[PDB]
C-alpha cells in the first residue's frame, strides 16, 4: 500500500476537509441569534466532550486497519457493512446540491470580471419596479413588495424561479449554469486519478489561499466605519438564553456539522500512512484551529454588515433576518459593490467561496473510490484512470434535478431534511459498533502498540458513555416537529416532509437490510451465525 509524500501533506488535508464555506455562515449566525457572545460557551465544552474524541477515534481505526471505507468493518464486525454502503449514496446526494453552491459563485466570477458591477445599479432586465436601492436624501421608501438588486440577480437570472412554481414543475435546466458544472468537474477528475500523489500537492495551494484571504478582508473591515456595531452584537454575553434547552442542542449540532467525523472521508487519510506517527498531536491541533478559523471568519462578515446597519438604518438582526445560504449572495454581495476599488475585493471574496468548496469535494471522491477496490480485488478499479471516470459522471447526471429552474427549492429539502439526519444516523451506528460490540477493552490495545502509552481516564469513559449519548440528543429533538422551510414567500405543502424523509431514509434503510443479508447466507444455529459475524477471523 502506498503512502503520502511528506509528513505535512496529510496534516494539511485533514484541516482542509474540516474547513469549508459553511464555516462562515452556519456557525456565526447562530452565535448572534442565540445570545450573542454567550453562544461561544457551549462551543468549547461540547467540543472536548463530543466533538474531539469522536474526531479522534475515526483516525485510530484508519491508522491500524489501513483499509478503506467498507473493509474496516470486515475486521471489526461484518454486519455493519451497511454503514459504508450508506455513505456512498450520500456522496452522490451531497454532490448534487453542493457543487451548485460554487456554481453560483463561478457565475459571479465571470459576471464581476468587468469594471462596472451589476449590483450597484438596476440597469438590467430584472423586476426594476422593485429595484429601488438608491439611498437618496430622505426621498426613499420601500413597500413590502420591494426587493434587493442582489436578490434580483440571484433569483431572476441565475436560478430563474419565475420560470417554475415549485416542486410540481422543475422543467428545463439553465444552459449557462450547466457550463459551470463542466468547469468544476474537470479539476476534480484531474487530481484523484493518480491517488495520493496528486492529492498531496493540490491542497498546497487551495488550503492556504482562503486563509490569506481572511487576512486581506479583515483589514478592509478593520479601518471601516460602523464596524464597532457588528462586534457589539457578536460579543455581548447574554446568559439568560442558556437556560433554554433548545440552544444546547443547536450548539452541539454546529460542531458536528463543522468538523464532520465518521462520514468515511477522513479515514482514507490515515489508511495511507505509517503507524509510528502520534495520532494524539495530529488530531488535537486540527480541532483547535477550526474553532480559531470560525472565530476569525465571523469577524470578516459582521464588521461589514454593521456598515449595512448604518446606511439602511436598522438593527443587524433586521438586515440578517434570512437563515441559510443566502447570507453571502444577498447581504454580503451588495456591500462589496458600494466600496471603493470594488473590482479587486469582489474577485478575491468570490474565489474564496470557490476554493473552500472544492477542498471538501476533493477528498469526498477519494472515500468512495477506495471502498470498492479492497473489498473486490481485481474486479473494480483495475484501471484507475477509467473507473473513477464512471463515478464522476453519475453525480453529474444526478445533479440535473438541482440545475433546474426550481433548483433553489430542491437544495433546501436535500440539505436539511434528506442529508441532515442522514449524517447523524450513519455516525451513531458506527459509534456503538466499535465501543460496545467490538469492545473498549480491545480497542485501546491497538492504540498503545502504535504509540507506546495507554490513553488516559478521560478518553476511556467518553468513548463508551459520552460519544454514544452525544448524538442521541441531537437526533431526538430533530424528529420532533417538521419545520416550515420558507423560501421567497413560497410555503411548502404538507407532504414535503413525507418526500423529504423518504429520500433521507433510503440510506438509513440500507443498514437493517445489510444486517439481514448476512444472517440468511450464513447457516447454522441462530446463536452461532450471529456470533460468527461479530467476532472477526
Amino acid at each position: 500500500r502506498e503512502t503520502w509524500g511528506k509528513k505535512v501533506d496529510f496534516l494539511l488535508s485533514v484541516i482542509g476537509y474540516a474547513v469549508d464555506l459553511g464555516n462562515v455562515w452556519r456557525f456565526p449566525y447562530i452565535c448572534a441569534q442565540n445570545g450573542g457572545g454567550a453562544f461561544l460557551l457551549p462551543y468549547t465544552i461540547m467540543a472536548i466532550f463530543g466533538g474531539i474524541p469522536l474526531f479522534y477515534m475515526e483516525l485510530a481505526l484508519g491508522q491500524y486497519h489501513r483499509n478503506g471505507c467498507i473493509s474496516i468493518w470486515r475486521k471489526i464486525c461484518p454486519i455493519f457493512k451497511g454503514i459504508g454502503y450508506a455513505i456512498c449514496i450520500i456522496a452522490f446526494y451531497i454532490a448534487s446540491y453542493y457543487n451548485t453552491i460554487m456554481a453560483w459563485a463561478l457565475y459571479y466570477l465571470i459576471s464581476s470580471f468587468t469594471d462596472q458591477l451589476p449590483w450597484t445599479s438596476c440597469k438590467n432586465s430584472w423586476n426594476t419596479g422593485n429595484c429601488t436601492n438608491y439611498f437618496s436624501e430622505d426621498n426613499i421608501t420601500w413597500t413590502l413588495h420591494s426587493t434587493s438588486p442582489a436578490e434580483e440577480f440571484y433569483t431572476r437570472h441565475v436560478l430563474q424561479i419565475h420560470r417554475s412554481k415549485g416542486l410540481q414543475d422543475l422543467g428545463g435546466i439553465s444552459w449557462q449554469l450547466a457550463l459551470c458544472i463542466m468547469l468544476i468537474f474537470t479539476v476534480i477528475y484531474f487530481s484523484i486519478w493518480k491517488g495520493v500523489k496528486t492529492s498531496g500537492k493540490v491542497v498546497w495551494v487551495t488550503a492556504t489561499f482562503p486563509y490569506i484571504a481572511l487576512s486581506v478582508l479583515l483589514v478592509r473591515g478593520a479601518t471601516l466605519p460602523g464596524a464597532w456595531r457588528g462586534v457589539l452584537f457578536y460579543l455581548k454575553p447574554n446568559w439568560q438564553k442558556l437556560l433554554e434547552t433548545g440552544v444546547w442542542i443547536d450548539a452541539a449540532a454546529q460542531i458536528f456539522f463543522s468538523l464532520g467525523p465518521g462520514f468515511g472521508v477522513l479515514l482514507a487519510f490515515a489508511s495511507y500512512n505509517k503507524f509510528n506517527n502520534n495520532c494524539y498531536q495530529d488530531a488535537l491541533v486540527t480541532s483547535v484551529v477550526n474553532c480559531m478559523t470560525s472565530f476569525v471568519s465571523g469577524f470578516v462578515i459582521f464588521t461589514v454588515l454593521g456598515y449595512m446597519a448604518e446606511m439602511r438604518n436598522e438593527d443587524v438582526s433586521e438586515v440578517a433576518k434570512d437563515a441559510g445560504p443566502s447570507l453571502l449572495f444577498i447581504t454580503y454581495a451588495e456591500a462589496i459593490a458600494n466600496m471603493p476599488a470594488s473590482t479587486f475585493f469582489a474577485i478575491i471574496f468570490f474565489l474564496m467561496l470557490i476554493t473552500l468548496g472544492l477542498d471538501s469535494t476533493f477528498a469526498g471522491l477519494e472515500g468512495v473510490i477506495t471502498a470498492v477496490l479492497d473489498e473486490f480485488p481485481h474486479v473494480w478499479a483495475k484501471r484507475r484512470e477509467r473507473f473513477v471516470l464512471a463515478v464522476v459522471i453519475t453525480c453529474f447526471f444526478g445533479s440535473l434535478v438541482t440545475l433546474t429552474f426550481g433548483g433553489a427549492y430542491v437544495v433546501k429539502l436535500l440539505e436539511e431534511y434528506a442529508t441532515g439526519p442522514a449524517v447523524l444516523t450513519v455516525a451513531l451506528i458506527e459509534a456503538v459498533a466499535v465501543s460496545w460490540f467490538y469492545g473498549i477493552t480491545q480497542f485501546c490495545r491497538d492504540v498503545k502498540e502504535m504509540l507506546g502509552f495507554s490513553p488516559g481516564w478521560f478518553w476511556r469513559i467518553c468513548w463508551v458513555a459520552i460519544s454514544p449519548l452525544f448524538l442521541l440528543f441531537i437526533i431526538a429533538s430533530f424528529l420532533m416537529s417538521p419545520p416550515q422551510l420558507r423560501l421567497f414567500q413560497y410555503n411548502y405543502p404538507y407532504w414535503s416532509i413525507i418526500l423529504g424523509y423518504a429520500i433521507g431514509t433510503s440510506s438509513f434503510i440500507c443498514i437493517p437490510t445489510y444486517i439481514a443479508y448476512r444472517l440468511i447466507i450464513t447457516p447454522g444455529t441462530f446463536k452461532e451465525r450471529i456470533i460468527k459475524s461479530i467476532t472477526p477471523e
Partner: single-chain antibody, 223 residues
Framework: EVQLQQSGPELVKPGASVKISCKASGYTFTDYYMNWVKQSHGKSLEWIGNINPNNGGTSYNQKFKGKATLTVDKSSTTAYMELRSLTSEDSAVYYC????????????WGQGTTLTVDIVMTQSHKFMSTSVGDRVSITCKASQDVSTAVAWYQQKPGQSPKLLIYSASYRYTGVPDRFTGSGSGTDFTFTISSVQAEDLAVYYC?????????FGGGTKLEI
C-alpha cells in the same frame, strides 16, 4: 384619502375575550403592514405587535406572549384581534395606523376605541414654562446606539396624533416649516421657532432602530 374606520366601544367583563377591528382603505392592503399602538390611560404609548399579511406570521412584545394574537383578512382588508385575561390594569385605548417598510414608521393614525374595564428613550422634564413665540427646545437621550431613527409626534387632548419629522432631519408632506430638528448618535434635540397656539400639544420621542420598537415618555409645551 387614507381613512381608518373605528368600531364603537363596549363594556366587557374581565377574563372574557374582546374583538376590535379597523378597516383599511385608500391604499393597497398588501403593500403596508397593520400595526397596533397601545394608548394607556394617563400615561405614554406602548407597542403591541406587528402582523405580516403576505404570510400570516406575526411578531409581538414579550408581554403579549399569552395574552393576544394577530390575524388579518385579505378578502375584506380588515384585521382582527382577540385579547384574553382582562384585568383592571388594561384600561387603555386601541389604535390603528399606517406603517412603511424599511424604516418602520407611523405615518397616519386612527381615531381609536376605548376599552373600559430594548432601547429605551429617556427625556427631560415635561413641564416647561416659556412665553408665546419664543424658541423652545426638547431634549431626548438614547440608552443605546440609534443612528437616525428618531421621530416626533403631536397629540392633542381628544385628537389623534400625526407624523411630523422624517428621519429627524427633514419635513413631511403636510407639515409647516416651524418644525425642524437634528441629531447624531446620542444628542437628539428638537426645536420649534415662533410657536403659536395651534402647536400647543403633547410631543413624543420615538425610536425605530431595533425590533421591538419602544416609544418615549412625552413632553408638553406650556408654552
Amino acid at each position: 384619502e387614507v381613512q381608518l374606520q373605528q368600531s364603537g366601544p363596549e363594556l366587557v367583563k374581565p377574563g372574557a375575550s374582546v374583538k376590535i377591528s379597523c378597516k383599511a382603505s385608500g391604499y393597497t392592503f398588501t403593500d403596508y403592514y397593520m400595526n397596533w399602538v397601545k394608548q394607556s390611560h394617563g400615561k405614554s404609548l406602548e407597542w403591541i405587535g406587528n402582523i405580516n399579511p403576505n404570510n400570516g406570521g406575526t411578531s409581538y412584545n414579550q408581554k403579549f406572549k399569552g395574552k393576544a394574537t394577530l390575524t388579518v383578512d385579505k378578502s375584506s382588508t380588515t384585521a382582527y384581534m382577540e385579547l384574553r385575561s382582562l384585568t383592571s390594569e388594561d384600561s387603555a385605548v386601541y389604535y390603528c395606523t399606517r406603517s412603511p417598510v424599511r424604516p418602520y414608521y407611523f405615518d397616519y393614525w386612527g381615531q381609536g376605541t376605548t376599552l373600559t374595564v430594548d432601547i429605551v428613550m429617556t427625556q427631560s422634564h415635561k413641564f416647561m414654562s416659556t412665553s408665546v413665540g419664543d424658541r423652545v427646545s426638547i431634549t431626548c437621550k438614547a440608552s443605546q446606539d440609534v443612528s437616525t431613527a428618531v421621530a416626533w409626534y403631536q397629540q392633542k387632548p381628544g385628537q389623534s396624533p400625526k407624523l411630523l419629522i422624517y428621519s429627524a432631519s427633514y419635513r413631511y408632506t403636510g407639515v409647516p416649516d416651524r418644525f425642524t430638528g437634528s441629531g447624531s448618535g446620542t444628542d437628539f434635540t428638537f426645536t420649534i421657532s415662533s410657536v403659536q397656539a395651534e402647536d400647543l400639544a403633547v410631543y413624543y420621542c420615538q425610536q425605530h432602530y431595533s425590533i421591538p420598537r419602544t416609544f418615549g415618555g412625552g413632553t408638553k409645551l406650556e408654552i
